[PDB]
Design a binder for this molecule. Structure first.
Ligand SMILES: NCCc1c[nH]cn1
Length: 145
């Protein structure tokens, strides 16, 4: 599997210099970002190959971090939205939609946890704890972020 790190390494110079924005989930539009977000959402296994959000990769993890009937509603909304867009762009629309919804703040936790869990920096059962926040801070620091 290509990793999030591999995606970042292949960013065009124009986007590498905005890596810290990207890793803070700031939205940046345009076709190279459409490509990057597809890459990372694939790497963390959140979307299908055409870029469609996978309800089942997120419903449980979202609810375990923070139980909320809105996660269901938001997933359906954002999947509905991404399916209406060209595939070149379907991962990024899903991601943007999720971040703009009330589920956004919990999605960022699930994403951060999955990234570090795959990188072997934390155990598979790692929760979003104070220690985890510090672990991610140190992780980003080594990336110049
Ligand atoms: N841990 C956040 C990495 C990221 C967020 N958005 C894109 N890449």
């Amino acid at each position: 599997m290509e990793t999030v790190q591999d995606c970042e390494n292949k960013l065009p110079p124009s986007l590498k210099s905005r890596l810290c924005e990207i890793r803070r989930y700031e939205i940046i539009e345009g076709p190279e970002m459409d490509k990057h977000i597809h890459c990372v959402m694939r790497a963390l296994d959140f979307v299908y190959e055409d870029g469609r959000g996978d309800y089942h990769k997120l419903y449980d993890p979202l609810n375990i971090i923070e139980l909320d009937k809105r996660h269901d509603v938001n997933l359906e909304k954002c999947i509905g939205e991404c399916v209406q867009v060209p595939t070149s762009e379907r991962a990024h629309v899903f991601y943007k939609c999720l971040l703009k919804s009330t589920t956004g703040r919990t999605f960022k936790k699930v994403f951060d946890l999955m990234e570090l869990k795959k990188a072997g920096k934390v155990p598979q059962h790692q929760r979003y704890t104070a220690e985890f926040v510090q672990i991610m801070k140190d992780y980003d620091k080594a990336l110049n972020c």
